[PDB]
Design an enzyme around this catalytic site. Sequence first.
Site, PDB file in Angstrom:
ATOM      1  N   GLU A 265       1.780   3.916  -3.277  1.00 48.87           N
ATOM      2  CA  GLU A 265       1.409   5.356  -3.256  1.00 48.87           C
ATOM      3  C   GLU A 265       2.633   6.217  -3.518  1.00 48.87           C
ATOM      4  O   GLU A 265       2.540   7.207  -4.225  1.00 48.87           O
ATOM      5  CB  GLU A 265       0.807   5.739  -1.907  1.00 48.87           C
ATOM      6  CG  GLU A 265      -0.592   5.168  -1.766  1.00 48.87           C
ATOM      7  CD  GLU A 265      -1.582   5.686  -2.802  1.00 48.87           C
ATOM      8  OE1 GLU A 265      -2.483   4.873  -3.232  1.00 48.87           O
ATOM      9  OE2 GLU A 265      -1.443   6.916  -3.173  1.00 48.87           O
TER      10      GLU A 265
ATOM     11  N   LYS B  12       3.704   6.042  -7.126  1.00 51.26           N
ATOM     12  CA  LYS B  12       2.793   6.781  -8.029  1.00 51.26           C
ATOM     13  C   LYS B  12       3.219   8.247  -8.022  1.00 51.26           C
ATOM     14  O   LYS B  12       3.428   8.797  -9.077  1.00 51.26           O
ATOM     15  CB  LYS B  12       1.326   6.572  -7.641  1.00 51.26           C
ATOM     16  CG  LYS B  12       0.703   5.307  -8.227  1.00 51.26           C
ATOM     17  CD  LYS B  12      -0.426   4.662  -7.426  1.00 51.26           C
ATOM     18  CE  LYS B  12      -1.513   5.612  -6.993  1.00 51.26           C
ATOM     19  NZ  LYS B  12      -2.562   4.897  -6.224  1.00 51.26           N
ATOM     20  N   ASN B  13       3.361   8.835  -6.842  1.00 50.37           N
ATOM     21  CA  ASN B  13       3.736  10.257  -6.631  1.00 50.37           C
ATOM     22  C   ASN B  13       5.045  10.566  -7.333  1.00 50.37           C
ATOM     23  O   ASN B  13       5.111  11.596  -7.989  1.00 50.37           O
ATOM     24  CB  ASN B  13       3.996  10.557  -5.158  1.00 50.37           C
ATOM     25  CG  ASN B  13       2.731  10.591  -4.336  1.00 50.37           C
ATOM     26  OD1 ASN B  13       1.649  10.497  -4.873  1.00 50.37           O
ATOM     27  ND2 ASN B  13       2.862  10.704  -3.032  1.00 50.37           N
TER      28      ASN B  13
ATOM     29  N   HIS C 266       0.866  -1.203   0.000  1.00 58.18           N
ATOM     30  CA  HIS C 266       0.000   0.000   0.000  1.00 58.18           C
ATOM     31  C   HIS C 266       0.899   1.248   0.000  1.00 58.18           C
ATOM     32  O   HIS C 266       0.676   2.166  -0.819  1.00 58.18           O
ATOM     33  CB  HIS C 266      -0.974  -0.062   1.189  1.00 58.18           C
ATOM     34  CG  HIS C 266      -2.106  -1.042   1.052  1.00 58.18           C
ATOM     35  ND1 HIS C 266      -2.473  -1.626  -0.152  1.00 58.18           N
ATOM     36  CD2 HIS C 266      -2.991  -1.499   1.966  1.00 58.18           C
ATOM     37  CE1 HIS C 266      -3.520  -2.400   0.042  1.00 58.18           C
ATOM     38  NE2 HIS C 266      -3.852  -2.339   1.328  1.00 58.18           N
TER      39      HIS C 266
HETATM   40  C1  LIG Z   1       0.884  21.044  -3.765  1.00 57.23           C
HETATM   41  O1  LIG Z   1       1.974  21.527  -4.543  1.00 57.23           O
HETATM   42  C2  LIG Z   1       2.912  20.609  -4.935  1.00 57.23           C
HETATM   43  C3  LIG Z   1       2.797  19.250  -4.747  1.00 57.23           C
HETATM   44  C4  LIG Z   1       3.793  18.363  -5.171  1.00 57.23           C
HETATM   45  C5  LIG Z   1       4.924  18.868  -5.796  1.00 57.23           C
HETATM   46  C6  LIG Z   1       5.043  20.249  -5.990  1.00 57.23           C
HETATM   47  C7  LIG Z   1       4.062  21.122  -5.571  1.00 57.23           C
HETATM   48  O2  LIG Z   1       4.115  22.483  -5.728  1.00 57.23           O
HETATM   49  C8  LIG Z   1       5.296  23.019  -6.315  1.00 57.23           C
HETATM   50  C9  LIG Z   1       6.036  17.965  -6.279  1.00 57.23           C
HETATM   51  C10 LIG Z   1       6.163  17.914  -7.798  1.00 57.23           C
HETATM   52  C11 LIG Z   1       5.056  18.007  -8.627  1.00 57.23           C
HETATM   53  C12 LIG Z   1       5.221  17.956 -10.004  1.00 57.23           C
HETATM   54  C13 LIG Z   1       6.488  17.812 -10.499  1.00 57.23           C
HETATM   55  N1  LIG Z   1       7.581  17.719  -9.726  1.00 57.23           N
HETATM   56  C14 LIG Z   1       7.404  17.771  -8.399  1.00 57.23           C
HETATM   57  N2  LIG Z   1       5.916  16.627  -5.688  1.00 57.23           N
HETATM   58  C15 LIG Z   1       6.953  15.985  -5.111  1.00 57.23           C
HETATM   59  O3  LIG Z   1       8.098  16.428  -5.141  1.00 57.23           O
HETATM   60  C16 LIG Z   1       6.682  14.686  -4.410  1.00 57.23           C
HETATM   61  C17 LIG Z   1       5.740  14.646  -3.375  1.00 57.23           C
HETATM   62  C18 LIG Z   1       5.471  13.475  -2.718  1.00 57.23           C
HETATM   63  C19 LIG Z   1       6.139  12.305  -3.079  1.00 57.23           C
HETATM   64  O4  LIG Z   1       5.874  11.141  -2.429  1.00 57.23           O
HETATM   65  C20 LIG Z   1       7.072  12.319  -4.098  1.00 57.23           C
HETATM   66  C21 LIG Z   1       7.347  13.502  -4.765  1.00 57.23           C
HETATM   67  O5  LIG Z   1       8.274  13.477  -5.764  1.00 57.23           O
HETATM   68  C22 LIG Z   1       4.569  16.068  -5.783  1.00 57.23           C
HETATM   69  C23 LIG Z   1       3.618  16.884  -4.940  1.00 57.23           C
END
Ligand SMILES: COc1cc2c(cc1OC)[C@H](c1cccnc1)N(C(=O)c1ccc(O)cc1O)CC2
Length: 345
Positions: free
Chosen positions: A228, A231-232, A224
């Site tokens: 997740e 995916k992120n 799980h």
């Molecule tokens: C709410 O605003 C934002 C959310 C998130 C990001 C950036 C945000 O604003 C600037 C960022 C991202 C999104 C798209 C491209 N590159 C990085 N993330 C991450 O870096 C990230 C987050 C969680 C995770 O588990 C892995 C990641 O690489 C996504 C979320």
Amino acid sequence: GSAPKYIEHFSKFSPSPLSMKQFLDFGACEKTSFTFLRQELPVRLANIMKEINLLPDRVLSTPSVQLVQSWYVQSLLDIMEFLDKDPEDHRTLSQFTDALVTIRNRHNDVVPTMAQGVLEYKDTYGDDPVSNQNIQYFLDRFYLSRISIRMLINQHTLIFDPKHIGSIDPNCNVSEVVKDAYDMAKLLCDKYYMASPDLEIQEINAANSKQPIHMVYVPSHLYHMLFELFKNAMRATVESHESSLILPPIKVMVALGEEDLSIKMSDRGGGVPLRKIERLFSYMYSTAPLAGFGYGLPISRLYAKYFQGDLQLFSMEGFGTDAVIYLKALSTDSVERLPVYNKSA
Ligand SMILES: COc1cc2c(cc1OC)[C@H](c1cccnc1)N(C(=O)c1ccc(O)cc1O)CC2
Ligand SMILES: CC(C)c1ccc(COc2ccc(CC(=O)NCCN)cc2Cl)cc1
Ligand SMILES: [Mg+2]
């Protein structure tokens, strides 16, 4: 009806945290699980039902809350039936299992049902930081309680229908589960984006640099969480690079220390400014493709916490994001974390 009486009775009791060891030593008799659970589920149901009932009327009166409150009531009443009954009678036992499976099915939709109440509250009353902390306080406890109950039920139904012990693998290969979650995230990523970053896994067994890393854990839980996070990390890597040509891999390090088993997932997707990290874990602020909006992060963090783990994000805006799953490593330190009803109301 007597539901509020029962809720009162059983919410005097404390949920009893079990360890991994205790969960394995049921691989003990079925009669013992039956007599344990017909006490313990009411205690755990009632403790949360009591906390639901403390919510302000404007929340409590909403259809979503009333609906899951009604499931929790039926489910409490379903287990009452068995309080007088005789363990020695093998048909008491098989009817109990029938009863747990029915209960499990009934509760399948709590997450999006409760999600619908968060959305209704956002539009009805607004999204101020105080609304936020309260929803966060309530749902971390509610969802963690829910996880703890599903664990009990699954353990019983899966054992009393031998190597895995229900949902627990005593020889869980961590890298194996990382790859599984990766392969599945890659599938969806390639579907929606027609490109996926590659995986690199490194392992560090501090004390035994040869031996592959095994632990006692609940693999579905670990899946799980890794699903997740993949995916992120895939969404972020891919979208930050649609101009660019290379897609950097996602790198997973698995470290086994004296007491921590740590799994870091390092992506090169341009990161998140420190300011915006906490919002990612917020039920309220993540309520409205692969990844992009859902309860994945906060709930994955609960699965981590459930056995005294954690799950943390550290980003470097302009570079990428590290997601770390911290688990216990030793089965002795791997004990249920339960929200208990008391003074702190
Ligand atoms: C709410 O605003 C934002 C959310 C998130 C990001 C950036 C945000 O604003 C600037 C960022 C991202 C999104 C798209 C491209 N590159 C990085 N993330 C991450 O870096 C990230 C987050 C969680 C995770 O588990 C892995 C990641 O690489 C996504 C979320
Ligand atoms: C449906 C679920 C997810 C849900 C939706 C919404 C909520 C929000 O609940 C709130 C909002 C504000 C306050 C502050 C206050 O004024 N306290 C006094 C009010 N008695 C307290 C609570 Cl418990 C919780 C759970
Ligand atoms: Mg964090």
